[PDB]
Amino acid sequence: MPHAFKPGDLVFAKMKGYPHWPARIDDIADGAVKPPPNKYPIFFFGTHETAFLGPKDLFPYDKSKDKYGKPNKRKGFNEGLWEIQNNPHASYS
Numbered sequence: 067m068p069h070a071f072k073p074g075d076l077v078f079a080k081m082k083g084y085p086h087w088p089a090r091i092d093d094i095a096d097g098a099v100k101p102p103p104n105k106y107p108i109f110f111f112g113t114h115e116t117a118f119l120g121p122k123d124l125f126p127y128d129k130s131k132d133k134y135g136k137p138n139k140r141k142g143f144n145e146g147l148w149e150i151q152n153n154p155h156a157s158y159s
């Protein structure tokens with residue numbers, strides 16, 4: 067059975083206006099800004115942007131990749147697909 071989301075989990079993450087996007091649940095570094103309650107820090111592959119999202123917008127990557135893991139015209143998306151498949155736990159700072 068599923069657990070709660072934890073840092074390192076791979077997802078597609080959904081935001082208004084954008085296709086389901088390859089992403090991971092990030093850690094919060096010591097001294098860094100914490101997310102709001104019930105929100106996770108989401109790191110978007112390809113764009114390397116961070117947003118705070120709740121589980122309603124988080125789709126586990128293995129279950130969803132057949133649906134969501136296809137190339138897209140949007141800036142950063144295809145680089146994002148490479149990252150999530152090839153080095154999803156790397157430093158992208």
Ligand SMILES: CC(=O)N1CCCNCC1
Nearest residue numbers: 081084087110113115117
């Ligand atoms: C984090 C964010 O605002 N976005 C929009 C730009 C593309 N990355 C997907 C989600």
